[PDB]
Ligand binder design. Structure first.
Ligand SMILES: Nc1ncnc2c1ncn2[C@@H]1O[C@H](COP(=O)(O)OP(=O)(O)O)[C@@H](O)[C@H]1O
Ligand SMILES: [Ca+2]
Ligand SMILES: [Ca+2]
Ligand SMILES: [Ca+2]
Ligand SMILES: [Ca+2]
Ligand SMILES: [Ca+2]
Ligand SMILES: [Ca+2]
Length: 369
């Protein structure tokens, strides 16, 4: 036992690295691609499968799969390929030398955590492992053990209330909208101005425009009203062919979808309503602690303006005397991984790891509680 590994299994991105590093060394797409024809398989190099950017480059030829599409792992043969890629191709480690901490989505079934554990020990021969809930790790990365996390990533968004380290399962809310939807919606709305962003390459360009220029308006209708005379709304962006496009109200219309899912044709409540609905499914006596500790996590919470908008919307739904605080750490794109890194580097607590001997002696029930 020397250096622990942290693997945050994201719906769109795997974040992995060594405990104790400040950020993950390896970040790649959680996609597996498989040829559909034997001749194509052999002609492209005899590889049975491709993972990450290699898989994405071969789209249209390979069948792509997202084995963690909405945060829960649904295909174990594909997941084994992602973990093999993580260990051998990205981190370049021998997994049998490292205790490995894995993350899991809110509401992950016990049988799913058991299958994750079985693969780590039987397939990769890790010496020890541990599974932690992603939102709890993000709460720890913010330095608290009580609070409600809003975690918006690539394929899913959750609201997870947590009391003294315990996620309250009956109050967890899941919204199947997150960054991949926002990138698709920005491609569509830019195509409204006479531009054309439709190819794989164009989606990557639009993902860059989203991450660099979008923001959350404090009020959508008033921001639209200010747009005509604003001297700072319009931004220019140079494309790869040297053309320059102008982006204006699309900067805030795109992320407005998190608060108004009807923009992409979803009937769901927006993230401020799900936050409130989650707090109201908790014991009345812990709500004050949740309202004062709303922690944002995940890549899709990176927009400038999001904390102020969430403060405004939550204030409008909560009792008038309620103290409301939104915490949006600067490193929140990686706060799940960072929480895992903090936890896995606490060698004083090395007995919390599940070792291979313990698993062999106790069975699959050992990874829970
Ligand atoms: N600065 C940013 N602004 C807006 N979205 C961002 C930013 N940085 C990353 N994202 C988006 O966040 C998503 C990835 O977030 P992440 O928390 O890693 O997701 P997951 O864990 O579900 O894979 C992608 O959709 C990405 O485009
Ligand atoms: Ca995630
Ligand atoms: Ca990468
Ligand atoms: Ca084109
Ligand atoms: Ca309004
Ligand atoms: Ca619909
Ligand atoms: Ca132990």
């Amino acid at each position: 036992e020397t250096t622990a590994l942290v693997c945050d299994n994201g719906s769109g991105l795997v974040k992995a690295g060594f405990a104790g590093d400040d950020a993950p060394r390896a970040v790649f797409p959680s996609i597996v691609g498989r040829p559909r024809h034997q001749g194509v398989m052999v002609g492209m190099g005899q590889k049975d499968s491709y993972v990450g950017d290699e898989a994405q480059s071969k789209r249209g030829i390979l069948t792509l799969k997202y084995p963690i599409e909405h945060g829960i792992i649904t295909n174990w043969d594909d997941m084994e390929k992602i973990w093999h890629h993580t260990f051998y191709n990205e981190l370049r480690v021998a997994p049998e030398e490292h205790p490995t901490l894995l993350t899991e989505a809110p509401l992950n079934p016990k049988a799913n955590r058991e299958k994750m554990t079985q693969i780590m020990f039987e397939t990769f021969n890790v010496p020890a492992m541990y599974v932690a809930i992603q939102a709890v790790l993000s709460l720890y990365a913010s330095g608290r053990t009580t609070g409600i996390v809003l975690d918006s990533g690539d394929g899913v968004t959750h609201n997870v209330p947590i009391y003294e380290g315990y996620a309250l399962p009956h109050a967890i809310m899941r919204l199947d909208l997150a960054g991949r939807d926002l990138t698709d919606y920005l491609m569509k709305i830019l195509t409204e101005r006479g531009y054309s962003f439709v190819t794989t390459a164009e989606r990557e360009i639009v993902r860059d425009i989203k991450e660099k220029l979008c923001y959350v308006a404090l009020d959508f209708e008033n921001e639209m009203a200010t747009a005509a005379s604003s001297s700072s709304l319009e931004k220019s962006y140079e494309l790869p062919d040297g053309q320059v496009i102008t982006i204006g109200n699309e900067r805030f219309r795109c992320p407005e979808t998190l608060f108004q899912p009807s923009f992409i044709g979803m009937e769901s409540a927006g993230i401020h309503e799900t936050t409130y609905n989650s707090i109201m499914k908790c014991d009345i006596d812990i709500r004050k602690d949740l309202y004062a500790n709303n922690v944002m996590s995940g890549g899709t919470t990176m927009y400038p303006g999001i904390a102020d908008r969430m403060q405004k919307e939550i204030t409008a739904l909560a009792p008038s005397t309620m103290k409301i605080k939104i915490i949006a750490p600067p490193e929140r794109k990686y706060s799940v991984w960072i929480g895992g890194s903090i936890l896995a580097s606490l060698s004083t607590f090395q007995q919390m790891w599940i070792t291979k001997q313990e698993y062999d002696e106790a069975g699959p029930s050992i990874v829970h509680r």
